Design a protein around this ligand. Sequence first.
Ligand SMILES: CC(C)CCC[C@@H](C)[C@H]1CC[C@H]2[C@@H]3CC=C4C[C@@H](OC(=O)CCC(=O)O)CC[C@]4(C)[C@H]3CC[C@]12C
Ligand SMILES: CC(C)CCC[C@@H](C)[C@H]1CC[C@H]2[C@@H]3CC=C4C[C@@H](OC(=O)CCC(=O)O)CC[C@]4(C)[C@H]3CC[C@]12C
Ligand SMILES: CC(C)CCC[C@@H](C)[C@H]1CC[C@H]2[C@@H]3CC=C4C[C@@H](OC(=O)CCC(=O)O)CC[C@]4(C)[C@H]3CC[C@]12C
Ligand SMILES: CC(C)CCC[C@@H](C)[C@H]1CC[C@H]2[C@@H]3CC=C4C[C@@H](OC(=O)CCC(=O)O)CC[C@]4(C)[C@H]3CC[C@]12C
Ligand SMILES: CC(C)CCC[C@@H](C)[C@H]1CC[C@H]2[C@@H]3CC=C4C[C@@H](OC(=O)CCC(=O)O)CC[C@]4(C)[C@H]3CC[C@]12C
Ligand SMILES: CC(C)CCC[C@@H](C)[C@H]1CC[C@H]2[C@@H]3CC=C4C[C@@H](OC(=O)CCC(=O)O)CC[C@]4(C)[C@H]3CC[C@]12C
Ligand SMILES: Cc1nc2nc(C3CC3)nn2c(O)c1NS(=O)(=O)c1ccc(C2CCCCC2)cc1
Ligand SMILES: *[C@@H]1O[C@H](CO)[C@@H](O[C@@H]2O[C@H](CO)[C@@H](O)[C@H](O)[C@H]2NC(C)=O)[C@H](O)[C@H]1NC(C)=O
Ligand SMILES: *[C@@H]1O[C@H](CO)[C@@H](O[C@@H]2O[C@H](CO)[C@@H](O)[C@H](O)[C@H]2NC(C)=O)[C@H](O)[C@H]1NC(C)=O
Ligand SMILES: *[C@@H]1O[C@H](CO)[C@@H](O)[C@H](O)[C@H]1NC(C)=O
Ligand SMILES: *[C@@H]1O[C@H](CO)[C@@H](O)[C@H](O)[C@H]1NC(C)=O
Ligand SMILES: *[C@@H]1O[C@H](CO)[C@@H](O)[C@H](O)[C@H]1NC(C)=O
Ligand SMILES: *[C@@H]1O[C@H](CO)[C@@H](O)[C@H](O)[C@H]1NC(C)=O
Ligand SMILES: CCCCCCCCCCCC
Ligand SMILES: CCCCCCCCCCCC
Ligand SMILES: N[C@@H](CCC(=O)O)C(=O)O
Ligand SMILES: CCCCCCC
Ligand SMILES: CCCCCC
Lengths: 280, 44, 392, 82
Amino acid sequence: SNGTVSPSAFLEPFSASVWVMMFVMLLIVSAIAVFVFEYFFTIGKAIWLLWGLVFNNSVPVQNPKGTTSKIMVSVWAFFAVIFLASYTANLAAFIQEEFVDQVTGLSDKKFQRPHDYSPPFRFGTVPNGSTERNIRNNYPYMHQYMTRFNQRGVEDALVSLKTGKLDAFIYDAAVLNYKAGRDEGCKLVTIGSGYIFATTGYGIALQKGSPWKRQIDLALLQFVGDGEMEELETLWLTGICHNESSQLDIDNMAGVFYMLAAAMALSLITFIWEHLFYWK
Amino acid sequence: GEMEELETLWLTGICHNESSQLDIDNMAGVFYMLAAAMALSLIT
Amino acid sequence: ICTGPNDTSPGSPRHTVPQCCYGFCIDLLIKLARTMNFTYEVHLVADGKFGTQERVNNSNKKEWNGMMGELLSGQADMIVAPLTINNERAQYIEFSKPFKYQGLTILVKKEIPRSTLDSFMQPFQSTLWLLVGLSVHVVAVMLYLLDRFSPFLTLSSAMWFSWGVLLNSGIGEGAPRSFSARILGMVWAGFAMIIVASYTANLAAFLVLDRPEERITGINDPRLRNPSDKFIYATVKQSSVDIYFRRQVELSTMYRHMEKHNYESAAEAIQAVRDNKLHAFIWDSAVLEFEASQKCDLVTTGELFFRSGFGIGMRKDSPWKQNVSLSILKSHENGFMEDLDKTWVRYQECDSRSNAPATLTFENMAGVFMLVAGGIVAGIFLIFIEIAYKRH
Amino acid sequence: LDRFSPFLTLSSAMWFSWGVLLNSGIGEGAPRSFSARILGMVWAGFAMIIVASYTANLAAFLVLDRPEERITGINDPRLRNP
Ligand SMILES: CC(C)CCC[C@@H](C)[C@H]1CC[C@H]2[C@@H]3CC=C4C[C@@H](OC(=O)CCC(=O)O)CC[C@]4(C)[C@H]3CC[C@]12C
Ligand SMILES: CC(C)CCC[C@@H](C)[C@H]1CC[C@H]2[C@@H]3CC=C4C[C@@H](OC(=O)CCC(=O)O)CC[C@]4(C)[C@H]3CC[C@]12C
Ligand SMILES: CC(C)CCC[C@@H](C)[C@H]1CC[C@H]2[C@@H]3CC=C4C[C@@H](OC(=O)CCC(=O)O)CC[C@]4(C)[C@H]3CC[C@]12C
Ligand SMILES: CC(C)CCC[C@@H](C)[C@H]1CC[C@H]2[C@@H]3CC=C4C[C@@H](OC(=O)CCC(=O)O)CC[C@]4(C)[C@H]3CC[C@]12C
Ligand SMILES: CC(C)CCC[C@@H](C)[C@H]1CC[C@H]2[C@@H]3CC=C4C[C@@H](OC(=O)CCC(=O)O)CC[C@]4(C)[C@H]3CC[C@]12C
Ligand SMILES: CC(C)CCC[C@@H](C)[C@H]1CC[C@H]2[C@@H]3CC=C4C[C@@H](OC(=O)CCC(=O)O)CC[C@]4(C)[C@H]3CC[C@]12C
Ligand SMILES: Cc1nc2nc(C3CC3)nn2c(O)c1NS(=O)(=O)c1ccc(C2CCCCC2)cc1
Ligand SMILES: *[C@@H]1O[C@H](CO)[C@@H](O[C@@H]2O[C@H](CO)[C@@H](O)[C@H](O)[C@H]2NC(C)=O)[C@H](O)[C@H]1NC(C)=O
Ligand SMILES: *[C@@H]1O[C@H](CO)[C@@H](O[C@@H]2O[C@H](CO)[C@@H](O)[C@H](O)[C@H]2NC(C)=O)[C@H](O)[C@H]1NC(C)=O
Ligand SMILES: *[C@@H]1O[C@H](CO)[C@@H](O)[C@H](O)[C@H]1NC(C)=O
Ligand SMILES: *[C@@H]1O[C@H](CO)[C@@H](O)[C@H](O)[C@H]1NC(C)=O
Ligand SMILES: *[C@@H]1O[C@H](CO)[C@@H](O)[C@H](O)[C@H]1NC(C)=O
Ligand SMILES: *[C@@H]1O[C@H](CO)[C@@H](O)[C@H](O)[C@H]1NC(C)=O
Ligand SMILES: CCCCCCCCCCCC
Ligand SMILES: CCCCCCCCCCCC
Ligand SMILES: N[C@@H](CCC(=O)O)C(=O)O
Ligand SMILES: CCCCCCC
Ligand SMILES: CCCCCC
């Protein structure tokens, strides 16, 4: 998918407890302390000064006059530079494109009931295989809907996915993993970060009662126990994408604008509230 | 290519293909600039 | 109702107390008994070992023990347990098709980071802090020394200018008047900017003291390859992973370490890893992954290796082999093994799996808040110092 | 908000917003009424977040990287699979 960024992406750099204790408890306590220092300029002005210093954007403030008040403002400015450093240090990685899978799994409502969706879901599998038999046995309705958007081969399904004529491709897990690994640019990926449903295996078929069955089983088990299977998997099954800065759009960082909108609403509400208080 | 696998099985190492404080020597340049500023201020 | 030994510790009278068994394998066994109607009678293996072919001290004889021995000697009839399918066991008993695919992996203790109170002073060495503190004041006094004796700034104004420029606070809105003081103050501002930027560039790194020292890159990492006294890594004694390590002629250098430290059962090994007695535990992917999911302070770090599957082993000539294998395959094909995974393995309470940079927490930066509190409790005295100064 | 307060001209408000967005200090004079003293400071936070987000990856976009040029021996995917 193109991916998505959560509206709170700009807010996780600190935990909720840290945010609320800095901007409610610590800040108001420090503002009250600044007033106590200066008195011995309204409290709104002290809160305004501290908040402007939290992120110094040259916002106009009214500095206090007492020396102790100036010292406390200095240590608050040190706390503010700590806060800005910690917040901006990892902000770029936190506001990053997060890729969410289209479907959770084979039991998702998109597969089970594709009709109750304004855009239809296009998923299919090649016929005459184990996957088709499994889907027919488990989900007859899903298989009946799937037969319409059938496929001819693995490469045909892959190019259908690439162009856009098909959305999902249900197939053998190992072949799909190999295709995802060998794919360039990694536009194709299996959901669930390697989700496997039937979890069977590849076997060497033999006639019933064949004398070669026991010897072949023992030889294969010896191969897997000697590490040769790992070597073969590295030689053949491994791919490109397995071993694995962008422009910012409105959708990328819409949360900051959401915060600004909430502030616009709150400002209008408090304007009406102040008018009501003044009138009455 | 068997020699490559032998040498990566035996002759391979740890430091191959492999959070520090800042002392005064790291900040030597900025302090030298400040000293030059003091000297320029005195001569001016 | 499963009748098993009472005391796990060796050298104790192992009374056969009837406990009760439940979980993945028990549910699978009940399903098997339902699909092919046979009656079962579960009983735990006498000794906690999974079972390997061992040389008894009576020479010229190899014996199977554990669950393998209990099945081969006729005491048992079917091993419904996470029995790994390997060549050594397959020669004597026949396994069904795997009902769970997994592999060996390494479980280690996830280091919880500790937040020192001097974390934010950590980026600068203490001599640098002292030097910058002295520099602030020498520049501050020299501003007013230059300004006062100027043919063309008081003490407080100069000090506040220097400190506010360093801290970026704007407390002192007093600019120097003399030219030389102008160059001196502006270059001091530049130096303060560079110092602040250099401090910022590593404040976050020094705030969280996490390094990938304990991170293990599978079994190919040197810390597993090269034994050491401190790095105590182990497995369950007398199990499938022990057979795998012994069989590997190339990895026998590891084996010399494995035999030195081994544990009676998986629970003891994971407890030892939890209590930092152990540095690494080699065990099956399923068990280690579930333990990491539930016991949240341990992490599975090793790259997956020796991919195999748990099999419901029976005797060499058992009438149920074909039917039990067919039943396992049928359960795999429909949504039964998935149900068992969901209800026994997939569930978790926390995973802590996120490659994003660590989120700052309250315990991580308590030093900053305590520094602000110290500023509060120092200013509360500075008020009295100021009034006393006003008295004089 | 300030003009219709129960108890800051256009140019001064313009300068306040511009100097808050990009910290230059041209905006002199904080908003008088409380209704604006909350919106203005939230706008200051918005400006800080925007500036920090723009700054965080400015050097990467100033000089383009070399993703494809970084060949890695014969294990290169653009070498292994031609
Ligand atoms: C009245 C004066 C002193 C201003 C007080 C500031 C608070 C009104 C703001 C500042 C920071 C705000 C917090 C900043 C971030 C947190 C985390 C945030 O949790 C998340 O990380 C996102 C959760 C989600 O995805 O919905 C929830 C709000 C909250 C508590 C905020 C609650 C409101 C806060 C405390
Ligand atoms: C001045 C004070 C009183 C207000 C400070 C603003 C923030 C505390 C509010 C304003 C807007 C709030 C956000 C607006 C809406 C978003 C989306 C909202 O939905 C989700 O992100 C869920 C996942 C998804 O939808 O993709 C979650 C909260 C959150 C981050 C909010 C988090 C808290 C916000 C930032
Ligand atoms: C008075 C309040 C309740 C509404 C007006 C608040 C304003 C401050 C506007 C200005 C711009 C508005 C934003 C501009 C457009 C975006 C996209 C908009 O739709 C999308 O996210 C899809 C992508 C796209 O629109 O391009 C969602 C709101 C949002 C954040 C807006 C939120 C409200 C904003 C911030
Ligand atoms: C000392 C005199 C020349 C006063 C004029 C400049 C001053 C502002 C001092 C303050 C700190 C002094 C620096 C502090 C200590 C260093 C270490 C020192 O570097 C070395 O080569 C010796 C090894 C070491 O001690 O680290 C000498 C320079 C220097 C940069 C000093 C240069 C002169 C500095 C900048
Ligand atoms: C805690 C560690 C990091 C050292 C920090 C030192 C500062 C907290 C002290 C040391 C010297 C103090 C200064 C020394 C004396 C001056 C003059 C002094 O002049 C007055 O008392 C009258 C002020 C007026 O009313 O205008 C004012 C404080 C001040 C700036 C002090 C401010 C606070 C200072 C810088
Ligand atoms: C470079 C890109 C981002 C566009 C830059 C826009 C500026 C060139 C314009 C837009 C808005 C203009 C301001 C908007 C209005 C104000 C008030 C205005 O006050 C007046 O006396 C005329 C209007 C009135 O009667 O209030 C003076 C200009 C000024 C500062 C303007 C200055 C020039 C501005 C900033
Ligand atoms: C060795 C050590 N172990 C610790 N365990 C803890 C924890 C979690 C509870 N903290 N901690 C340490 O902080 C140290 N280091 S210290 O004793 O040289 C030291 C002490 C105090 C301060 C200031 C920091 C600013 C506020 C005022 C106190 C600075 C350095
Ligand atoms: C799957 O199997 C069916 C047969 O069960 C194949 O259908 C045949 O297709 C060929 C070529 O189109 C025709 O000549 C035959 O007459 C078809 N036989 C029947 C009974 O339909 C189908 O082609 C196979 N599909 C794939 C992709 O393997
Ligand atoms: C294993 O399963 C097969 C198939 O269900 C069983 O074979 C059936 O047995 C019944 C009862 O004797 C007969 O009526 C059927 O005709 C048999 N069908 C086949 C395919 O042979 C078999 O009895 C089961 N054996 C075990 C070990 O329980
Ligand atoms: C985003 O997804 C849509 C489908 O919803 C697709 O048409 C479009 O091409 C995607 N954007 C990109 C980056 O191509
Ligand atoms: C047997 O089990 C009981 C708990 O049911 C325990 O208290 C007792 O000590 C055990 N006896 C042995 C074998 O020591
Ligand atoms: C098992 O099922 C058969 C019917 O298929 C029944 O006749 C028999 O009594 C049942 N009991 C056993 C254990 O054979
Ligand atoms: C040999 O094994 C038997 C049975 O476990 C034990 O009783 C005996 O003490 C052992 N002898 C030696 C020399 O280990
Ligand atoms: C009239 C004021 C002139 C001030 C010159 C300051 C030069 C600072 C150099 C900083 C280089 C990073
Ligand atoms: C005079 C009261 C000022 C209160 C300022 C609150 C600003 C909240 C901004 C939140 C940004 C995350
Ligand atoms: N491994 C599968 C390939 C075909 C499919 O997945 O449908 C089989 O032999 O049946
Ligand atoms: C001891 C003085 C510390 C100043 C820190 C400025 C970032
Ligand atoms: C007034 C100086 C405060 C410094 C805090 C580190």
